[PDB]
Design a protein around this ligand. Sequence first.
Ligand SMILES: NC(=O)c1ccc[n+]([C@@H]2O[C@H](COP(=O)([O-])OP(=O)(O)OC[C@H]3O[C@@H](n4cnc5c(N)ncnc54)[C@H](OP(=O)(O)O)[C@@H]3O)[C@@H](O)[C@H]2O)c1
Ligand SMILES: COc1ccc2c(C(=S)N(C)CC(=O)O)cccc2c1C(F)(F)F
Length: 315
Amino acid sequence: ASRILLNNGAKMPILGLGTWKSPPGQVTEAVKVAIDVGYRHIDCAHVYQNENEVGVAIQEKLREQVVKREELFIVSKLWCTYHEKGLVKGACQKTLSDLKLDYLDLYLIHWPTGFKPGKEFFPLDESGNVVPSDTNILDTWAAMEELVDEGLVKAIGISNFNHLQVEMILNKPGLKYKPAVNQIECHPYLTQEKLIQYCQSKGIVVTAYSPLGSPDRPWAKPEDPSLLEDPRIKAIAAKHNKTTAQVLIRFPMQRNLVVIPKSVTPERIAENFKVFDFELSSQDMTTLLSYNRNWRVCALMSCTSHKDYPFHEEF
Ligand SMILES: NC(=O)c1ccc[n+]([C@@H]2O[C@H](COP(=O)([O-])OP(=O)(O)OC[C@H]3O[C@@H](n4cnc5c(N)ncnc54)[C@H](OP(=O)(O)O)[C@@H]3O)[C@@H](O)[C@H]2O)c1
Ligand SMILES: COc1ccc2c(C(=S)N(C)CC(=O)O)cccc2c1C(F)(F)F
């Protein structure tokens, strides 16, 4: 079952390619290979600084008649320094021009935290705390709604919103469109049962990021657990004659989640897609869930400071 029905009436492929930390010199090839082997969903963001190169790949495959625009599902995200209502369209418009698209299938508020606007993506004070902006997320939501009504994006959603924050959008006075997606970190060490159950109960689809535990994250520490090297997970892989990565991708799929593993390695790209020919047992699923430890790749300690920091609450 390759696509899930969103509350805007559209269908979203449950496997997409992530692009965070995909180097600009390699990500054009990575996205071309991904399209060639089956992927139809690419997860992007202005802050990754590689959307132009992603867009070159998309356009080449459109031009080559490999894929049709309607069959692709291209996602990007509104960076934190653009939460002011006056900046949202332009932020979107940049992303469209870079990806060489005239609409996005899905546009997310990347983080609940607005940052001070300017050329800096990560503005810090003379002590290093992130400098917030005085933007209310409801007002940012209203600006996202306008994008739908302008034809620039087919669906809007959120990312890294905790339960109170999703609830805040859903109770927005005058809410016109419900979020379609909440994109959050999720893997056997951070299983998110409460937030996921809450979102699904509201008709919001959850996308799972860092499903392999982001071994290329720049802040990796030796003492950090490692999904890909966890002997318990390797064993489950071995019982199904798949790799560990394949188990880690199949796992959210069986929880009715969308999942976006990143790779710029052609063999891994292809491997990561071969996840529709096997099923984890109920016991496997329960077992993988038992590994939870509230471990986050994206803990973002410099943001703990911010009003809307989403991870003070477990969910
Ligand atoms: N919205 C948010 O706040 C947010 C935050 C973080 C991430 N995300 C999205 O989620 C995507 C995925 O998360 P991530 O990039 O943090 O990490 P990830 O997908 O968990 O892991 C990426 C790492 O795993 C490696 N890898 C890929 N396939 C592998 C395989 N089959 N075997 C062994 N290693 C493999 C990649 O190496 P190579 O590339 O060298 O092959 C890379 O080092 C991102 O790229 C981004 O699109 C969203
Ligand atoms: C909301 O705060 C964020 C959000 C994202 C980041 C990232 C990024 S771009 N990611 C974790 C990837 C992603 O957000 O998709 C890198 C470094 C600091 C960040 C911070 C930080 F505040 F720590 F600066």
